[PDB]
């Protein structure tokens, strides 16, 4: 019986320059350290 | 300015790019302004 591991769907999140330097300024949001953890939690829930 | 950094160009989107932006605004709180219309200026000093 054969077991294959082929590709899964990628999780993308655009990081523009104007979006990060506004969320860091106004709402004090780390615009990459919050997009990466909401990418990982989406993938880890698609496991379960 | 951003050097490379993933910001693609709009004309030839293959070569590396160097995108530059400049965010600013100019604001008027009270409008203290006057206009001095100068007409017939072609004969300013060389008139007659």
């Amino acid at each position: 019986k054969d077991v294959v591991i082929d590709t899964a769907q990628h999780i993308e999140a655009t990081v523009p320059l104007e979006v990060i330097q506004d969320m860091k300024a106004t709402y004090d949001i780390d615009g990459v350290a919050r997009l990466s953890e909401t990418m990982s939690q989406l993938s880890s829930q698609k496991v379960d | 300015v951003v050097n490379g950094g993933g910001y693609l160009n709009t004309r030839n989107p293959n070569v590396p790019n160097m995108m530059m932006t400049r965010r600013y605004t100019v604001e008027s709180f009270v409008p203290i302004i006057g206009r001095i219309t100068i007409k017939n200026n072609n004969g300013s000093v060389y008139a007659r």
Side-chain angles (χ1 to χ4, degrees), chain B residues 8-27:
Chain B
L8 291 195
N9 207 65
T10 63
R11 302 204 67 246
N12 180 263
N14 307 111
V15 299
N17 209 18
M18 187 174 45
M19 208 83 100
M20 193 263 310
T21 192
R22 178 192 200 113
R23 304 187 82 207
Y24 70 102
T25 190
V26 49
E27 295 293 18

Side-chain angles (χ1 to χ4, degrees), chain B residues 26-43:
Chain B
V26 49
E27 295 293 18
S28 87
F29 294 94
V30 304
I32 310 173
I33 182 180
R35 176 163 316 275
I36 312 297
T37 291
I38 300 178
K39 57 189 182 65
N40 289 113
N41 198 260
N42 53 275

Side-chain angles (χ1 to χ4, degrees), chain A residues 17 22, chain B residues 7 23:
Chain A
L17 197 46
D22 286 33
Chain B
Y7 265 96
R23 304 187 82 207

Side-chain angles (χ1 to χ4, degrees), chain A residues 17-48:
Chain A
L17 197 46
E18 67 254 24
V19 179
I20 305 306
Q21 72 191 15
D22 286 33
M23 280 156 30
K24 185 61 184 177
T26 64
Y27 297 116
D28 208 358
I29 305 174
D30 270 297
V32 54
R34 290 294 97 80
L35 277 185
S36 68
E37 307 314 309
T38 196
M39 274 153 60
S40 177
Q41 286 167 182
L42 165 62
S43 89
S44 314
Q45 201 192 9
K46 200 37 177 46
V47 172
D48 294 11

